Amino acid sequence: DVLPPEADSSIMMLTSDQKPDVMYADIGGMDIQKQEVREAVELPLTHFELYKQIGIDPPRGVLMYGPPGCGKTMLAKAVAHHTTAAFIRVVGSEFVQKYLGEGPRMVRDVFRLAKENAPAIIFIDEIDAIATKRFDAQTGADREVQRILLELLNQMDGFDQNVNVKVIMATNRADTLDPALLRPGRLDRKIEFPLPDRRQKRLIFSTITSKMNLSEEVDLEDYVARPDKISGADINSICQESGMLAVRENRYIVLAKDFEKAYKTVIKKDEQEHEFYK
Amino acid sequence: LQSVGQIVGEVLKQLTEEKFIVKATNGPRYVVGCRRQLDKSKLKPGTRV
Amino acid sequence: MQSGIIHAAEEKDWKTAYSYFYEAFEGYDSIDSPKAITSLKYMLLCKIMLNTPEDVQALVSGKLALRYAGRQTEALKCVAQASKNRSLADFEKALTDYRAELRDDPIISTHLAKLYDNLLEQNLIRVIEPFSRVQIEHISSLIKLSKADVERKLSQMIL
Amino acid sequence: AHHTDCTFIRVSGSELVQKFIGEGARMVRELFVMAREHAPSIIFMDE
Amino acid sequence: EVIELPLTNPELFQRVGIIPPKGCLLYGPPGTGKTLLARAVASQLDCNFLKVVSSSIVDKYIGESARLIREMFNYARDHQPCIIFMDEIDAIGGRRFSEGTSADREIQRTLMELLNQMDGFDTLHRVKMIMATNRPDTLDPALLRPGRLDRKIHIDLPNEQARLDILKIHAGPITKHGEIDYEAIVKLSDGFNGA
Amino acid sequence: AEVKGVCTEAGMYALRERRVHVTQEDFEMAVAKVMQKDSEK
Amino acid sequence: KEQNGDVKEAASILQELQVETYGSMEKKERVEFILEQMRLCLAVKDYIRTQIISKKINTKFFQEENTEKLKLKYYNLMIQLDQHEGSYLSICKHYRAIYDTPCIQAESEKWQQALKSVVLYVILAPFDNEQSDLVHRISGDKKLEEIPKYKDLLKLFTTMELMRWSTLVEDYGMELRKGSLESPATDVFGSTEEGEKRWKDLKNRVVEHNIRIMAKYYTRITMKRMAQLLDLSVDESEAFLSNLVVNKTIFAKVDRLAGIINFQRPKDPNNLLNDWSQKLNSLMSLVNKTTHLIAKEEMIHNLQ
């Protein structure tokens, strides 16, 4: 007897309690990557007729990478919260299991569910857990992972270019990625997540500080000029522990006298380069 | 003599109220039904049996 | 702003103009008011004429738009109200009342034309809705227009 | 290679393709025992 | 401030409108009061405390380390007040590798998956991660990230008054005639451990 | 190599103004942006 | 309160009112300081901000065990604010809510006239299905015979029919100008501007009642006839039908050339054949079987 398709890896996403409720206004001043991710998955999943009538072969899959904590997860959170069609995700390590050959089932059933369900979007992260460079086909432990790579790479190609399934790829270290995995036909679009420096820095400041007190005079543009390449994630940490400092002194409004010691608490990278060498 | 009912699995999806799909903790999945007093609505996808 | 103005001549799309005026708002926000107010009146202006009944009042309700509640905002909101209510006499009265602040646009031809006849045709579809057959003098009295112009407009509206 | 009706082959030295050549295939010359099975063939690889 | 106050008094945080910190880590010279805190903090509730050596997790099987830490986090979500603890995380930490050996594959896999399990598509609520290692010079910046691990706490070699108080604590079970200048031992002590 | 990138990105420009036909200014805008990318590094 | 309050003092209050709401709820002081600025912002003649910050005190209930002197005495500003616009059903439900404390404080002087007011301007709201649910709710309570004219108010309840406005005016001039309590008449018709707004509202009510009764029991009808039943001119009649058909409340085709209109819908042959089919099946199957089996019961009852 034949059966309707089924996957257990990522059931679906019940989506009523699974929405991350992250707004596009929540992410701070990253108009660029939001623009080409709307161009990448949002518009083609709906206006597929436009892409066929212009004939610019819309991308099967787009990979995102970069330094850690540049917002690579919250972009996925926001597009999953704001999508109209179906979406699915799985942590990118569950394709290894206790027994033999479960992983090929774990990828084939989720691809089959993506095909069956809707014009959906599948999210895969940490490809370095599943995509390495070399292999030792004598451990047995490795044999499963070049296998599961084998099957994912094959079941990429089982699309008719008409199904509106979009895969979004996340990783931290792009060095381990095999070039044929990013070969055109599989991942024809790649985007890096650069560390914001000045243009976005006051923007992410403003977005994270819109929910704070900042009573009358707490300056921010004196902090945007400070060098040494502050990342994106740690601004959240700065505001968070500044609030911790404010609540330790039993004060319900954060003052400007908190932020300088708050800033010197976190970064702490002093010089690491002797000045005569400069 | 009748406490041999020993093997443990996990349910996958509801086919009908009497047709179910389960996965053994050893290997292959299976098609399995239930007795008529097990609260078949309570057997959500995601529980051990 | 220049792109939104220039491509609002062939009358193809104003959503492009709407996006241009939006990014003009967050450009000019809190730094350049004399471009901000005229960009706001342009954005509401281009939005209303493509049949956005309540979107004028909804979009002006935002705080960034609440802070700019000048005479242009009342002009556009009463224009939108008359549009969604089809009160052409009220539309002309509001046009006369705000004509000092409605002649400020260097583009005038888009508005004294191309919206007047549109409003007239929704007046026709709002007055035909009660009856099935009528005499022409009754509807001419109901809308307070002439005969021959209404006769030819009814000819096109039957064509 | 397509115009000449020759079996286009290229190798990147990856280990995914390694299992398609031999069990360990420690050298590279092993490729020939299958390459000569498609005698109209051409060898290519990148930088 | 992070391990006790939000668990009992979370209201001030939403009064100020920010999430309490997700976890912290400890570092310093070896034997310099970490697990005293950890076996001292462990003597507070004894019901919300799970504590592992970062070495029993690995196993010769295929991927069961990921399975066991998955159900570990599931157990943490089962009882909403829970405090997890991993000490000497270097055994799982490392920096990264470009596949020298083959064991690096699944141990790094376990690492990556632990990262996505601690901040991926989930509100890890009322669960705090306090860490401990001898040397943080061999840790992944992905694990070191302020979004990932919020506050770093250094423990230095004990100061002279700190050494004084420590030896006074270790002067509990002593029998002798008391004519001792503790200051002499304190002054002769320099760079000495907490143990 | 960049020629196909320019033509694809010109079609992308064509798709962001919602038009069924690409215009001659789309190509020059695309090659201008690719030239700016060439200015980077 | 030192400066006796003005626009500026209330604007000064308006910012810090929510601070203790993020601090702590106490069910007696915090609600008082949540409602004092309600009163102040009403005095500023601002309503939008007033109602937004009013959306915090609405959930502040179940406290009525000791908040009797405080609970509904701050409910007068909500009805004032909703009286500023047209929100008739909202304030009717508000008075239905604001009845428990005067019921505890029953003397029929600050007790009965509240009921008189709410049942008086339940009519003032437009026709509506849960409005009919509310008129079912408020009818039947054992105090409504205390109002003597409530039996006359029962006219606009069911068996609608003709509502000749001259008869209503002749019956209600005294209840609008005189009475033992007379207070809702002052609240509704006694004022000049509010009185005239209620007057034209009641005219709108009675004319749409006649529209509804003609919608229920008419196929075709003439303008002279429906005008003389409406006790109003033909032009204003056609205006009312025109502005009530754009609301799609009542389907009609009001044709103004010969003089006759219809109220019915153009009849789909699918619809008519369907109606004949379903009435055929039901009313010659089930009642037929029922009659047969009660005939069996009848012969069972008497001699076999």
Ligand SMILES: Nc1ncnc2c1ncn2[C@@H]1O[C@H](COP(=O)(O)OP(=O)(O)OP(=O)(O)O)[C@@H](O)[C@H]1O
């Ligand atoms: N625009 C932004 N830039 C940086 N951080 C942001 C931004 N918006 C929100 N954040 C928050 O700042 C921290 C940095 O991002 P986060 O920790 O989510 O890393 P990530 O890149 O999303 O994840 P990963 O790097 O593991 O893929 C997080 O708390 C994140 O939610």
Ligand SMILES: Nc1ncnc2c1ncn2[C@@H]1O[C@H](COP(=O)(O)OP(=O)(O)OP(=O)(O)O)[C@@H](O)[C@H]1O
């Ligand atoms: N600040 C201190 N006060 C008192 N005793 C201390 C202190 N620091 C260390 N010790 C002593 O050090 C010994 C080891 O303690 P513990 O097992 O907690 O080590 P740790 O500081 O966590 O470091 P490590 O795990 O690297 O040994 C104990 O006997 C304890 O009394």
